[PDB]
Design a protein around this motif. Structure first.
Motif, PDB file in Angstrom:
ATOM      1  N   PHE A 164       6.199  -9.146  85.695  1.00 49.97           N
ATOM      2  CA  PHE A 164       6.943  -8.800  86.368  1.00 49.97           C
ATOM      3  C   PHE A 164       6.887 -10.032  87.660  1.00 49.97           C
ATOM      4  N   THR A 208       0.537  -4.768  86.977  1.00 44.29           N
ATOM      5  CA  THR A 208      -0.241  -4.613  85.154  1.00 44.29           C
ATOM      6  C   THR A 208      -0.578  -2.937  84.971  1.00 44.29           C
ATOM      7  N   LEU A 226      -3.484  -1.133  83.129  1.00 47.57           N
ATOM      8  CA  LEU A 226      -4.423  -1.012  82.589  1.00 47.57           C
ATOM      9  C   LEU A 226      -4.491   0.640  81.745  1.00 47.57           C
ATOM     10  N   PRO A 250       9.571 -14.039  82.306  1.00 47.43           N
ATOM     11  CA  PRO A 250       8.535 -14.653  82.800  1.00 47.43           C
ATOM     12  C   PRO A 250       7.394 -15.312  82.195  1.00 47.43           C
ATOM     13  N   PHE A 304       1.347 -13.619  82.269  1.00 45.82           N
ATOM     14  CA  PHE A 304       0.207 -13.714  83.050  1.00 45.82           C
ATOM     15  C   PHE A 304      -0.490 -12.673  83.256  1.00 45.82           C
ATOM     16  N   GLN A 352      -6.011  -9.989  80.608  1.00 46.50           N
ATOM     17  CA  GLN A 352      -5.106  -8.733  80.198  1.00 46.50           C
ATOM     18  C   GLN A 352      -4.183  -8.266  80.060  1.00 46.50           C
ATOM     19  N   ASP A 353      -3.650  -8.010  78.938  1.00 44.65           N
ATOM     20  CA  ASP A 353      -1.962  -7.928  78.642  1.00 44.65           C
ATOM     21  C   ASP A 353      -1.674  -9.219  77.835  1.00 44.65           C
TER      22      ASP A 353
END
Ligand SMILES: *[C@@H]1O[C@H](CO)[C@@H](O)[C@H](O)[C@H]1NC(C)=O
Ligand SMILES: *[C@@H]1O[C@H](CO)[C@@H](O)[C@H](O)[C@H]1NC(C)=O
Lengths: 22, 39
Positions: free
Chosen positions: A5, A9, A11, B7, B10, B31-32
């Protein structure tokens, strides 16, 4: 009962719900 | 034609590493992210 976005984030927690239940 | 814009992936980079007096080998966590989009 409890159900709900641009650099954001999320976690994941170190302990999963299964481990807390254990 | 209607097109959706999202997007591309990232996320943060973490370095998992034992102390330098133990060893120099490290691992990297993205991460992710799909493992298919790392390179
Ligand atoms: C790293 O390991 C060596 C070997 O055991 C030890 O003597 C040294 O104090 C350690 N260094 C640190 C900064 O803890
Ligand atoms: C990883 O990427 C593939 C390729 O499109 C996609 O199908 C998959 O859903 C991604 N992984 C996850 C957990 O969403």
């Amino acid at each position: 009962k409890v159900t709900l976005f641009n650099g954001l984030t999320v976690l994941p927690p170190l302990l999963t719900d299964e481990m807390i239940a254990q | 034609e209607i097109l959706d814009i999202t997007p591309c992936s990232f996320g943060g980079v973490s370095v998992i590493t034992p102390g330098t007096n133990t060893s120099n080998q490290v691992a990297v966590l993205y991460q992710d992210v799909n493992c298919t989009e790392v390179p």
